[PDB]
Structures are given as structure tokens and as C-alpha cells.
PDB file of C-alpha atoms and ligand atoms in Angstrom:
ATOM      1  CA  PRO A  15     170.545-157.283  61.821  1.00 24.02           C
ATOM      2  CA  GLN A  16     168.385-156.915  64.907  1.00 22.20           C
ATOM      3  CA  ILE A  17     166.055-153.951  64.945  1.00 22.37           C
ATOM      4  CA  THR A  18     164.166-152.564  67.896  1.00 23.32           C
ATOM      5  CA  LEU A  19     160.950-150.660  67.639  1.00 27.56           C
ATOM      6  CA  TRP A  20     161.512-147.587  69.780  1.00 25.93           C
ATOM      7  CA  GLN A  21     161.541-145.875  66.385  1.00 23.38           C
ATOM      8  CA  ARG A  22     160.140-146.557  62.915  1.00 23.98           C
ATOM      9  CA  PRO A  23     162.120-149.303  61.187  1.00 24.10           C
ATOM     10  CA  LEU A  24     163.171-147.185  58.177  1.00 21.70           C
ATOM     11  CA  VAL A  25     165.705-148.869  56.031  1.00 22.64           C
ATOM     12  CA  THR A  26     167.640-148.041  52.869  1.00 19.32           C
ATOM     13  CA  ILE A  27     166.661-149.782  49.650  1.00 21.85           C
ATOM     14  CA  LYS A  28     168.130-149.417  46.184  1.00 19.49           C
ATOM     15  CA  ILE A  29     165.541-149.777  43.472  1.00 20.08           C
ATOM     16  CA  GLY A  30     166.764-149.603  39.914  1.00 20.62           C
ATOM     17  CA  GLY A  31     169.841-147.565  40.702  1.00 22.33           C
ATOM     18  CA  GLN A  32     167.972-145.112  42.970  1.00 23.02           C
ATOM     19  CA  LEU A  33     168.187-144.969  46.778  1.00 21.92           C
ATOM     20  CA  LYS A  34     165.037-144.630  48.836  1.00 21.21           C
ATOM     21  CA  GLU A  35     163.994-145.136  52.456  1.00 24.26           C
ATOM     22  CA  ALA A  36     161.469-147.819  53.284  1.00 22.86           C
ATOM     23  CA  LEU A  37     159.794-149.083  56.378  1.00 24.78           C
ATOM     24  CA  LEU A  38     159.960-152.795  57.277  1.00 23.75           C
ATOM     25  CA  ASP A  39     156.279-153.497  57.760  1.00 26.08           C
ATOM     26  CA  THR A  40     154.983-156.871  59.110  1.00 28.03           C
ATOM     27  CA  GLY A  41     151.362-155.769  58.724  1.00 27.51           C
ATOM     28  CA  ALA A  42     151.774-155.419  54.953  1.00 27.49           C
ATOM     29  CA  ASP A  43     151.222-158.529  52.832  1.00 27.30           C
ATOM     30  CA  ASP A  44     152.833-156.732  49.897  1.00 26.20           C
ATOM     31  CA  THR A  45     155.478-154.091  49.118  1.00 23.39           C
ATOM     32  CA  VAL A  46     154.062-150.645  48.166  1.00 25.02           C
ATOM     33  CA  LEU A  47     156.218-147.837  46.879  1.00 25.37           C
ATOM     34  CA  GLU A  48     155.547-144.180  46.267  1.00 22.84           C
ATOM     35  CA  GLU A  49     154.905-143.078  42.679  1.00 24.13           C
ATOM     36  CA  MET A  50     157.586-143.900  40.209  1.00 20.82           C
ATOM     37  CA  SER A  51     158.391-145.632  36.970  1.00 22.22           C
ATOM     38  CA  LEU A  52     159.834-149.123  36.759  1.00 23.57           C
ATOM     39  CA  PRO A  53     161.346-151.088  33.786  1.00 22.95           C
ATOM     40  CA  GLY A  54     158.097-152.780  32.660  1.00 19.80           C
ATOM     41  CA  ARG A  55     154.455-153.429  31.918  1.00 19.03           C
ATOM     42  CA  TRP A  56     152.056-152.969  34.871  1.00 17.21           C
ATOM     43  CA  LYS A  57     148.631-154.424  35.807  1.00 16.15           C
ATOM     44  CA  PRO A  58     145.939-152.919  38.045  1.00 14.99           C
ATOM     45  CA  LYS A  59     145.441-153.903  41.698  1.00 14.75           C
ATOM     46  CA  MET A  60     143.388-152.763  44.639  1.00 17.15           C
ATOM     47  CA  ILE A  61     144.858-152.759  48.114  1.00 15.43           C
ATOM     48  CA  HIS A  62     143.275-152.172  51.447  1.00 11.81           C
ATOM     49  CA  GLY A  63     144.841-150.016  54.100  1.00 11.37           C
ATOM     50  CA  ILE A  64     143.580-148.583  57.349  1.00 10.09           C
ATOM     51  CA  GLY A  65     142.006-145.509  55.776  1.00 10.40           C
ATOM     52  CA  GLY A  66     140.405-147.420  52.906  1.00  9.90           C
ATOM     53  CA  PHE A  67     141.246-148.819  49.440  1.00  5.72           C
ATOM     54  CA  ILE A  68     143.739-147.633  46.856  1.00  2.45           C
ATOM     55  CA  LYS A  69     144.416-148.636  43.257  1.00  6.41           C
ATOM     56  CA  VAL A  70     148.058-149.416  42.705  1.00  7.10           C
ATOM     57  CA  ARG A  71     150.188-150.506  39.752  1.00  9.30           C
ATOM     58  CA  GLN A  72     151.584-154.032  39.938  1.00 10.94           C
ATOM     59  CA  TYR A  73     155.027-154.757  38.419  1.00 10.08           C
ATOM     60  CA  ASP A  74     156.588-158.212  38.681  1.00  9.19           C
ATOM     61  CA  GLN A  75     160.133-159.595  38.806  1.00 10.02           C
ATOM     62  CA  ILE A  76     161.521-156.263  40.069  1.00 10.70           C
ATOM     63  CA  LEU A  77     165.033-156.430  41.592  1.00 16.29           C
ATOM     64  CA  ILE A  78     165.438-154.428  44.774  1.00 13.85           C
ATOM     65  CA  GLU A  79     168.148-154.450  47.409  1.00 12.51           C
ATOM     66  CA  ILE A  80     167.307-154.055  51.059  1.00 12.80           C
ATOM     67  CA  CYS A  81     170.177-153.350  53.447  1.00 13.70           C
ATOM     68  CA  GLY A  82     172.566-155.364  51.245  1.00 12.95           C
ATOM     69  CA  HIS A  83     170.093-158.177  50.538  1.00 12.73           C
ATOM     70  CA  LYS A  84     168.947-158.213  46.915  1.00  9.91           C
ATOM     71  CA  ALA A  85     165.364-159.398  46.380  1.00  8.50           C
ATOM     72  CA  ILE A  86     163.388-159.911  43.209  1.00  8.91           C
ATOM     73  CA  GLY A  87     159.657-159.691  43.289  1.00 11.56           C
ATOM     74  CA  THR A  88     156.357-158.032  42.914  1.00 10.81           C
ATOM     75  CA  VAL A  89     156.286-154.316  43.720  1.00 10.16           C
ATOM     76  CA  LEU A  90     153.130-152.181  43.911  1.00 13.97           C
ATOM     77  CA  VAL A  91     153.319-148.459  43.024  1.00 12.08           C
ATOM     78  CA  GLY A  92     150.630-146.105  44.278  1.00 13.27           C
ATOM     79  CA  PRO A  93     149.656-143.140  46.535  1.00 13.93           C
ATOM     80  CA  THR A  94     151.214-144.420  49.758  1.00 15.07           C
ATOM     81  CA  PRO A  95     152.442-141.944  52.408  1.00 18.25           C
ATOM     82  CA  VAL A  96     155.726-143.952  52.755  1.00 16.36           C
ATOM     83  CA  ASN A  97     157.536-146.795  50.975  1.00 18.67           C
ATOM     84  CA  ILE A  98     156.529-150.119  52.575  1.00 19.69           C
ATOM     85  CA  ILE A  99     158.481-153.383  52.410  1.00 21.86           C
ATOM     86  CA  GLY A 100     155.821-156.034  52.953  1.00 20.84           C
ATOM     87  CA  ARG A 101     156.071-159.690  53.916  1.00 24.12           C
ATOM     88  CA  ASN A 102     156.484-160.793  50.290  1.00 26.49           C
ATOM     89  CA  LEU A 103     160.035-159.415  50.411  1.00 24.50           C
ATOM     90  CA  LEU A 104     160.496-159.778  54.152  1.00 20.72           C
ATOM     91  CA  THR A 105     160.181-163.595  53.838  1.00 22.68           C
ATOM     92  CA  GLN A 106     162.815-163.436  51.071  1.00 20.61           C
ATOM     93  CA  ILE A 107     165.480-161.637  53.148  1.00 22.50           C
ATOM     94  CA  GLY A 108     164.999-163.942  56.155  1.00 18.86           C
ATOM     95  CA  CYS A 109     163.145-161.563  58.411  1.00 17.84           C
ATOM     96  CA  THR A 110     161.311-162.860  61.570  1.00 15.16           C
ATOM     97  CA  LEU A 111     159.732-161.256  64.684  1.00 16.01           C
ATOM     98  CA  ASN A 112     161.248-162.165  68.119  1.00 16.26           C
ATOM     99  CA  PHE A 113     160.399-161.716  71.853  1.00 11.51           C
TER     100      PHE A 113
ATOM    101  CA  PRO B  14     159.513-166.993  70.396  1.00  8.14           C
ATOM    102  CA  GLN B  15     160.386-166.520  66.777  1.00 10.13           C
ATOM    103  CA  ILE B  16     157.656-165.631  64.283  1.00  9.91           C
ATOM    104  CA  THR B  17     157.972-166.219  60.526  1.00 11.08           C
ATOM    105  CA  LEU B  18     156.379-163.969  57.908  1.00 10.68           C
ATOM    106  CA  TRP B  19     155.079-166.719  55.585  1.00  7.31           C
ATOM    107  CA  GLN B  20     151.624-165.901  56.962  1.00  7.72           C
ATOM    108  CA  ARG B  21     150.120-162.851  58.682  1.00  8.64           C
ATOM    109  CA  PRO B  22     151.671-162.583  62.146  1.00  7.29           C
ATOM    110  CA  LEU B  23     148.442-163.070  64.084  1.00  2.54           C
ATOM    111  CA  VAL B  24     148.486-163.436  67.871  1.00  4.50           C
ATOM    112  CA  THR B  25     145.757-163.720  70.484  1.00  2.94           C
ATOM    113  CA  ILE B  26     145.456-160.892  72.966  1.00  2.00           C
ATOM    114  CA  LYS B  27     143.392-160.328  76.036  1.00  2.00           C
ATOM    115  CA  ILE B  28     142.001-156.837  76.513  1.00  2.00           C
ATOM    116  CA  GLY B  29     139.182-155.943  78.894  1.00  2.00           C
ATOM    117  CA  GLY B  30     138.565-159.547  79.916  1.00  2.00           C
ATOM    118  CA  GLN B  31     137.941-160.290  76.217  1.00  2.00           C
ATOM    119  CA  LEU B  32     140.071-162.487  73.988  1.00  2.00           C
ATOM    120  CA  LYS B  33     140.822-160.961  70.574  1.00  2.00           C
ATOM    121  CA  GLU B  34     143.072-161.757  67.608  1.00  2.00           C
ATOM    122  CA  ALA B  35     145.504-159.127  66.440  1.00  2.00           C
ATOM    123  CA  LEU B  36     148.177-158.445  63.837  1.00  2.00           C
ATOM    124  CA  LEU B  37     151.773-157.766  64.999  1.00  2.00           C
ATOM    125  CA  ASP B  38     152.333-154.730  62.827  1.00  2.00           C
ATOM    126  CA  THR B  39     155.778-153.103  62.691  1.00  3.65           C
ATOM    127  CA  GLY B  40     154.468-150.456  60.331  1.00  5.02           C
ATOM    128  CA  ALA B  41     151.976-149.191  62.906  1.00  4.94           C
ATOM    129  CA  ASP B  42     152.999-146.351  65.273  1.00  3.81           C
ATOM    130  CA  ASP B  43     150.138-147.308  67.555  1.00  3.91           C
ATOM    131  CA  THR B  44     147.755-150.018  68.476  1.00  2.28           C
ATOM    132  CA  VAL B  45     144.282-149.751  67.019  1.00  3.08           C
ATOM    133  CA  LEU B  46     141.582-152.234  67.770  1.00  2.01           C
ATOM    134  CA  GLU B  47     138.282-152.633  65.958  1.00  2.00           C
ATOM    135  CA  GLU B  48     135.156-151.011  67.422  1.00  2.00           C
ATOM    136  CA  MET B  49     134.488-152.582  70.850  1.00  2.00           C
ATOM    137  CA  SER B  50     132.935-151.738  74.225  1.00  2.00           C
ATOM    138  CA  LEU B  51     135.654-150.679  76.630  1.00  2.00           C
ATOM    139  CA  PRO B  52     135.107-148.848  79.977  1.00  2.00           C
ATOM    140  CA  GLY B  53     136.848-145.599  80.751  1.00  2.00           C
ATOM    141  CA  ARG B  54     137.181-142.086  79.416  1.00  2.00           C
ATOM    142  CA  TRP B  55     138.572-141.045  76.039  1.00  2.00           C
ATOM    143  CA  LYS B  56     139.501-138.160  73.760  1.00  2.00           C
ATOM    144  CA  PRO B  57     139.393-138.281  69.953  1.00  2.00           C
ATOM    145  CA  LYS B  58     142.352-138.469  67.675  1.00  2.00           C
ATOM    146  CA  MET B  59     142.902-138.901  63.999  1.00  2.00           C
ATOM    147  CA  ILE B  60     145.389-141.140  62.199  1.00  2.00           C
ATOM    148  CA  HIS B  61     146.129-142.264  58.685  1.00  2.00           C
ATOM    149  CA  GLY B  62     147.358-145.124  56.644  1.00  2.00           C
ATOM    150  CA  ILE B  63     147.372-146.133  53.013  1.00  2.00           C
ATOM    151  CA  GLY B  64     143.671-145.511  52.625  1.00  2.00           C
ATOM    152  CA  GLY B  65     143.634-142.092  54.277  1.00  2.00           C
ATOM    153  CA  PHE B  66     142.527-140.604  57.639  1.00  2.00           C
ATOM    154  CA  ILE B  67     140.242-142.195  60.278  1.00  2.00           C
ATOM    155  CA  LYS B  68     138.827-140.755  63.493  1.00  2.00           C
ATOM    156  CA  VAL B  69     139.550-142.963  66.482  1.00  2.00           C
ATOM    157  CA  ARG B  70     138.666-142.904  70.209  1.00  2.00           C
ATOM    158  CA  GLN B  71     141.930-142.715  72.155  1.00  2.00           C
ATOM    159  CA  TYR B  72     142.299-144.595  75.501  1.00  2.00           C
ATOM    160  CA  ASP B  73     145.495-144.430  77.630  1.00  2.00           C
ATOM    161  CA  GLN B  74     147.332-146.703  80.135  1.00  2.00           C
ATOM    162  CA  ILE B  75     145.273-149.762  79.166  1.00  2.00           C
ATOM    163  CA  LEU B  76     146.502-153.236  80.138  1.00  2.00           C
ATOM    164  CA  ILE B  77     146.741-155.704  77.286  1.00  2.00           C
ATOM    165  CA  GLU B  78     148.116-159.227  77.600  1.00  2.00           C
ATOM    166  CA  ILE B  79     149.936-160.201  74.403  1.00  2.00           C
ATOM    167  CA  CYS B  80     151.193-163.792  74.044  1.00  2.00           C
ATOM    168  CA  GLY B  81     151.732-164.194  77.807  1.00  2.00           C
ATOM    169  CA  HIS B  82     153.282-160.801  78.523  1.00  2.00           C
ATOM    170  CA  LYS B  83     151.157-158.096  80.178  1.00  2.00           C
ATOM    171  CA  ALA B  84     151.556-154.528  78.894  1.00  2.00           C
ATOM    172  CA  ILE B  85     150.374-150.956  79.499  1.00  2.00           C
ATOM    173  CA  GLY B  86     149.738-148.452  76.733  1.00  2.00           C
ATOM    174  CA  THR B  87     147.421-146.304  74.680  1.00  2.00           C
ATOM    175  CA  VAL B  88     144.825-148.128  72.635  1.00  2.00           C
ATOM    176  CA  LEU B  89     142.872-146.547  69.734  1.00  2.00           C
ATOM    177  CA  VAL B  90     139.357-147.806  69.002  1.00  2.00           C
ATOM    178  CA  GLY B  91     137.959-147.204  65.563  1.00  2.00           C
ATOM    179  CA  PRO B  92     137.033-148.446  62.046  1.00  2.00           C
ATOM    180  CA  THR B  93     140.164-150.566  61.605  1.00  2.00           C
ATOM    181  CA  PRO B  94     139.750-153.601  59.304  1.00  2.00           C
ATOM    182  CA  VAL B  95     141.886-155.733  61.621  1.00  2.00           C
ATOM    183  CA  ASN B  96     142.992-155.357  65.238  1.00  2.00           C
ATOM    184  CA  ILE B  97     146.568-153.980  65.199  1.00  2.00           C
ATOM    185  CA  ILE B  98     149.374-154.237  67.805  1.00  2.00           C
ATOM    186  CA  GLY B  99     151.587-151.272  67.016  1.00  2.00           C
ATOM    187  CA  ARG B 100     155.149-150.403  67.834  1.00  2.00           C
ATOM    188  CA  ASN B 101     153.823-148.743  71.024  1.00  2.00           C
ATOM    189  CA  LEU B 102     153.128-152.156  72.546  1.00  2.00           C
ATOM    190  CA  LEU B 103     155.555-154.266  70.543  1.00  2.00           C
ATOM    191  CA  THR B 104     158.341-152.351  72.351  1.00  2.00           C
ATOM    192  CA  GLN B 105     156.803-153.224  75.775  1.00  2.00           C
ATOM    193  CA  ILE B 106     156.918-157.008  75.293  1.00  2.00           C
ATOM    194  CA  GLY B 107     160.459-156.829  73.876  1.00  2.00           C
ATOM    195  CA  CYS B 108     159.757-157.513  70.214  1.00  2.00           C
ATOM    196  CA  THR B 109     162.510-157.101  67.593  1.00  2.00           C
ATOM    197  CA  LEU B 110     162.912-157.472  63.826  1.00  2.00           C
ATOM    198  CA  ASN B 111     165.687-159.813  62.892  1.00  2.00           C
ATOM    199  CA  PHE B 112     167.289-160.688  59.538  1.00  2.00           C
TER     200      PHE B 112
HETATM  201  C1  U0E C 222     148.926-152.445  53.980  1.00  2.00           C
HETATM  202  C2  U0E C 222     148.667-151.668  54.922  1.00  2.00           C
HETATM  203  O1  U0E C 222     148.003-150.626  54.739  1.00  2.00           O
HETATM  204  N1  U0E C 222     149.161-152.047  56.115  1.00  2.00           N
HETATM  205  C3  U0E C 222     148.846-151.376  57.388  1.00  2.00           C
HETATM  206  C4  U0E C 222     148.310-152.375  58.384  1.00  2.00           C
HETATM  207  C5  U0E C 222     146.949-153.005  58.237  1.00  2.00           C
HETATM  208  C6  U0E C 222     146.012-152.191  57.364  1.00  2.00           C
HETATM  209  C7  U0E C 222     144.615-152.767  57.374  1.00  2.00           C
HETATM  210  C8  U0E C 222     144.632-154.239  56.947  1.00  2.00           C
HETATM  211  C9  U0E C 222     145.685-155.095  57.681  1.00  2.00           C
HETATM  212  C10 U0E C 222     147.031-154.418  57.704  1.00  2.00           C
HETATM  213  C11 U0E C 222     150.087-150.664  58.025  1.00  2.00           C
HETATM  214  O2  U0E C 222     150.997-151.620  58.544  1.00  2.00           O
HETATM  215  C12 U0E C 222     150.812-149.795  57.016  1.00  2.00           C
HETATM  216  C13 U0E C 222     151.251-148.471  57.616  1.00  2.00           C
HETATM  217  C14 U0E C 222     150.089-147.874  58.422  1.00  2.00           C
HETATM  218  O3  U0E C 222     148.931-147.790  57.959  1.00  2.00           O
HETATM  219  N2  U0E C 222     150.393-147.498  59.657  1.00  2.00           N
HETATM  220  C15 U0E C 222     149.609-146.462  60.300  1.00  2.00           C
HETATM  221  C16 U0E C 222     148.487-147.070  61.176  1.00  2.00           C
HETATM  222  C17 U0E C 222     148.761-147.180  62.662  1.00  2.00           C
HETATM  223  C18 U0E C 222     148.521-145.889  63.390  1.00  2.00           C
HETATM  224  N3  U0E C 222     147.346-145.317  63.209  1.00  2.00           N
HETATM  225  O4  U0E C 222     149.395-145.391  64.084  1.00  2.00           O
HETATM  226  C19 U0E C 222     150.495-145.493  61.058  1.00  2.00           C
HETATM  227  O5  U0E C 222     151.593-145.834  61.499  1.00  2.00           O
HETATM  228  N4  U0E C 222     150.018-144.264  61.144  1.00  2.00           N
HETATM  229  C20 U0E C 222     150.781-143.188  61.729  1.00  2.00           C
HETATM  230  C21 U0E C 222     151.533-142.419  60.648  1.00  2.00           C
HETATM  231  C22 U0E C 222     152.838-143.057  60.241  1.00  2.00           C
HETATM  232  C23 U0E C 222     153.036-142.979  58.745  1.00  2.00           C
HETATM  233  N5  U0E C 222     154.376-142.517  58.401  1.00  2.00           N
HETATM  234  C24 U0E C 222     154.652-141.304  57.924  1.00  2.00           C
HETATM  235  N6  U0E C 222     153.681-140.546  57.414  1.00  2.00           N
HETATM  236  N7  U0E C 222     155.900-140.851  57.951  1.00  2.00           N
HETATM  237  C25 U0E C 222     149.757-142.297  62.389  1.00  2.00           C
HETATM  238  N8  U0E C 222     150.204-141.761  63.511  1.00  2.00           N
HETATM  239  O6  U0E C 222     148.615-142.117  61.945  1.00  2.00           O
HETATM  240  C26 U0E C 222     151.778-147.517  56.490  1.00  2.00           C
HETATM  241  C27 U0E C 222     150.660-146.959  55.631  1.00  2.00           C
HETATM  242  C28 U0E C 222     152.639-146.416  57.057  1.00  2.00           C
END
């Protein structure tokens, strides 16, 4: 697809059977999702956002689908205001920026 | 041009006669640059990200030159970790997300 930025690039992702809306975010190294429970063991991580730092829960090898593209990878769960699809999964689906 | 997400999408911008480096951020509504001396008037605003809320000095109709293309828009100056080019200016230089 080709997406323009007149509006927030919200997209539909399916994570473990459930459907959620996520924003394609080029400024995010990683993928951060709102609070939830995934199928595994988690480790602690600290991420830095604009307003400061947050502790998140790292899960690995998580399968997620993004607009029909399935991805497998690291997902961070924490107190984020919105689900964010970072570059770790953006690189996987073939996403690039163009002008 | 086409930008890949393997690394942080950093670009060089010229604002106020100064050359800066900034992140092409599709997750950002606006453009927020680190604390700098810029001439003009301004009114405060508040915004938030993953860390929380920050108070920024809002400046409007500012000319920024991003990778060769000139552009007019609002610029927020505050405690941002990195200079950010938000959707407000990414739209102006014709940037799209493709995958
Ligand atoms: C990982 C992360 O943290 N990466 C940041 C970018 C940046 C953070 C500092 C280090 C380098 C990378 C953003 O890429 C993520 C994005 C974000 O921080 N973007 C803000 C900032 C720009 C701005 N001040 O506009 C934003 O868009 N703020 C809007 C509210 C929209 C949120 N959406 C809803 N609540 N629905 C606002 N008007 O305050 C998420 C949290 C939504």
C-alpha cells in the first residue's frame, strides 16, 4: 500500500487472534503495545519516549499480522497511549518512506 | 527518494539559518525540535508521548528546508530527546509510507 500522512497512519493488526489498531511509526525503533498478555515469558526493558522513560515487558518470537503481512518478532508491552508498530516490524513488512 | 527503515530515518534540515539533524517520524502529529534560539513570538502548548506530557513553546508558519524541499509550518521547541519532523511537515514535502 501507499499511505499519506494527512491523517494518523492507523492500521489493523491481529495479535494472537485479537484485532487491534496500531500506528505505523518510523520514529519508533521497537513495537510497543498497550497492556495485555501474550503466550510467553517476559523480560524487563526500559524505553525512552518524548515525555520520559517507561518500563515495558519484552516478549520475543511473537507472531503478528499487519494489514495481511504476518510478522514474527519482539513486542514490548507497557503503558503506551496507542499501539505502535516500530521499525523492527516495519523493516520486516517491506515498509519505506518516499518523497 | 526512498528511505529504508534498517536505521533511524535521519535527515538534515535547515531551520533559522542553522543546520540540524532530525528524525522523520510518522508517529508524530507535529514537529518538535530540541531547545534552540529562534526569533519570533510564541504561545505555550503541551503534548505527550510514551513518557508523558511536556510543555513546549509553539511557533507558527516557520520555514524549514527538509532534504531540498522548503516548507512552512508550526514548530514546537522543547525538551525533546531528538529533533522530530512530524506529519505536519512530512505532508508538505510529499512524504508517503509504502509497503
Ligand atoms: C518511541 C517513541 O516514543 N517514539 C516517539 C518518537 C521519538 C521519541 C523520543 C526518542 C526518538 C523517537 C513517537 O514517534 C511515538 C509517538 C509520539 O510520541 N508522538 C507524539 C509526539 C509528537 C507530538 N508532540 O505531536 C504525538 O504524536 N503526540 C500527539 C498525540 C498523539 C498520540 N495519539 C493518541 N493519543 N491518539 C500530541 N499532540 O501530543 C507515540 C507515543 C504516539
